[PDB]
Design a protein around this ligand. Structure first.
Ligand SMILES: Cc1cc2nc3c(=O)[nH]c(=O)nc-3n(C[C@H](O)[C@H](O)[C@H](O)COP(=O)(O)O)c2cc1C
Ligand SMILES: Cc1cc2nc3c(=O)[nH]c(=O)nc-3n(C[C@H](O)[C@H](O)[C@H](O)COP(=O)(O)O)c2cc1C
Ligand SMILES: O=C(O)c1cc(=O)[nH]c(=O)[nH]1
Ligand SMILES: O=C(O)c1cc(=O)[nH]c(=O)[nH]1
Ligand code: NI
Lengths: 313, 313
């Protein structure tokens, strides 16, 4: 009588849950573990053309209300994630997203040219990251609407497939309108993932009288409980302003109820970051169970019945 | 042996605590209550040239982790707050800040021209709000740097006194740098208040499947526990980039420990919003007491001894 099934991008997903890019998806063993998990899908660590060591440690800290990180894009490099998608991933189990985070337009252009064939042959789907806020001396691409337009223009020009974009959060309607206007000019952009972390917060430990991460004087992206209302705002804002596109939710999901809120705001897929970092891939069994439980109590049978139907006053 | 005393802008404050603008400071009764409280200071509700009714209700909601509001600047009008500063306020009890939020540059200019004489005669201090996120169709001035520079020029032109600016949160270093560079052009800007609410979040009540405030489809500014690391980040960011100015902290202060963090980050004064809304002006006796307790356990006697001294790794 009940179903968490999702159909989009010419795929069927058993449920809307997946990891947030960058969480538990860097190594072969992590990718295998996500594939073997109860999640409906998975996305690989945001990649650069060559392997990156990332920022000095400590660079992640769990917190009572979430997390702060300045990882600095540590990743195995594009060849590695391309090879996983081309040769190793079991598409029989679930669809695969590959997150790309080139440090320049030219890097994204070069990687997309090579990804094209693998997307065609295997069905891997590109999630293009325009919102990394932890690489020193590199402003978030999507806070500069001109840099955003140019990046999307280049990728659309060279990449012969649909793709999605991972967005930083915005905090005013003018920004929502400006971002949506740009995104709506690109028909290949078929999903929008809202949101990446809330950028450059600063956690201070009262006992040590110090920051808690090493890079960038302790400034890092916030995730977890801190970001849920901001995530829902962005999910709903683009859900409304980009009616021709799907929205993937990301931010502050720890429970089936949290996920229910994401869907109500407009989300098709629901990404899990901080909570997954702290619990491991077994969380997806708990989350599907919980979401089904929420739906049971509210008398919903499918996600379609309430997606985007949040009531305004 | 210990003291919460603060000295700035030719004034002495018994302690760093004050209300955040907009919280419990709209009516005569509220202003007197703040003046009679244990707070080191107070600021009046952000004003427009004429009275405003504000947005339709409900327009504020207390939450487990903070608050969301879209008040829409309900206020008694400039004449009313000017009159309170000129004629009624007991400066013998504590200094007074007047918050100003004209809906246009020209509105601020005209109010400042009239405030000048009262500042001279009575010592009231202007906090110029460049960051109201809840009046529909009106974008936050401080997210537009050229506009911000223009406004500060226009005001400095007509207002022969020191003043401060209430800033929205920023989320990347390029933005910290740009804002600080504008503010550093204007010597009259002697303090910076970080931060106004995190703008346009969206709270959804899972039981009702609806938003919780009426204006703007449920979108509103976030305060409280949600905003503390963003507040600390902005306090510290401007503390570092504007060494010729003082920083007032605002955001997420519920305890003396929270206030201790604000000061460590660089704050001279510490403003209390959401917590004050939920607890009333008695909160200031608890906060002074708690901060003294935190200082005793840590063997500090004055705020100077640790202000801005947060340790990086
Ligand atoms: C450790 C860590 C690494 C992350 N790395 C990436 C990344 O490589 N690419 C990306 O798009 N987002 C990255 N993020 C952001 C998350 O994908 C997600 O947008 C954010 O953490 C909010 O979700 P949460 O509240 O569930 O954590 C990372 C987050 C964390 C905590
Ligand atoms: C009810 C309410 C009304 C507010 N009105 C104003 C205002 O008139 N002027 C202003 O600068 N900020 C206003 N704000 C923002 C607060 O001054 C403060 O910057 C924000 O709430 C963060 O502090 P908190 O975390 O202590 O709530 C208001 C906040 C609340 C909750
Ligand atoms: O690798 C990182 O540091 C990182 C990337 C990103 O997109 N988001 C994030 O929070 N961290
Ligand atoms: O009156 C309001 O709506 C308001 C003004 C402001 O500056 N900040 C805020 O959170 N609310
Ligand atoms: Ni922004």
């Amino acid at each position: 009588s009940m179903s968490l099934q999702v159909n989009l991008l010419n795929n069927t997903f058993a449920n809307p849950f997946m990891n947030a890019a960058g969480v538990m998806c860097t190594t072969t063993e992590e990718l295998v573990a996500m594939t073997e998990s109860a999640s409906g899908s998975l996305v690989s660590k945001s990649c650069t053309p060559a392997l990156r060591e990332g920022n000095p440690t400590p660079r992640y800290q769990a917190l009572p209300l979430g997390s702060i990180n300045s990882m600095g894009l540590p990743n195995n490099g594009f060849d590695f994630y391309l090879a996983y998608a081309a040769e190793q991933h079991d598409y029989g189990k679930k669809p695969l997203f590959l997150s790309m985070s080139g440090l320049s337009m030219r890097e994204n252009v070069e990687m997309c040219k090579r990804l094209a064939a693998v997307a065609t042959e295997k069905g891997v789907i590109l999630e293009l990251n325009l919102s990394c806020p932890n690489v020193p001396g590199k402003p978030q691409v999507a806070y500069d609407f001109d840099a955003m337009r140019q990046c999307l223009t280049a990728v659309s020009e060279v990449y012969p497939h649909s793709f999605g974009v991972k967005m930083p959060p915005y905090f005013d309607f003018a920004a929502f309108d400006a971002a949506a206007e740009i995104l709506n000019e690109f028909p290949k952009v078929q999903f929008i993932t809202c949101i990446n972390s809330i950028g450059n917060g600063l956690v201070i430990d009262a006992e040590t009288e110090s920051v808690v991460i090493k890079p960038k004087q302790g400034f890092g992206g916030l995730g977890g409980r801190y970001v849920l209302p901001t995530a829902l705002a962005n999910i709903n804002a683009f859900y409304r302003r980009c009616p021709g596109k799907l929205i993937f939710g990301c931010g502050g999901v720890y429970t089936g109820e949290d996920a229910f809120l994401h869907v109500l705001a407009g989300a098709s897929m629901v990404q899990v970051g901080t909570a997954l970092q702290e619990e491991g891939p077994s969380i997806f069994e708990r989350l599907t169970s919980e979401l089904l439980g929420v739906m049971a109590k509210k008398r919903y049978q499918t996600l379609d019945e309430f997606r985007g139907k949040v009531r305004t006053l």
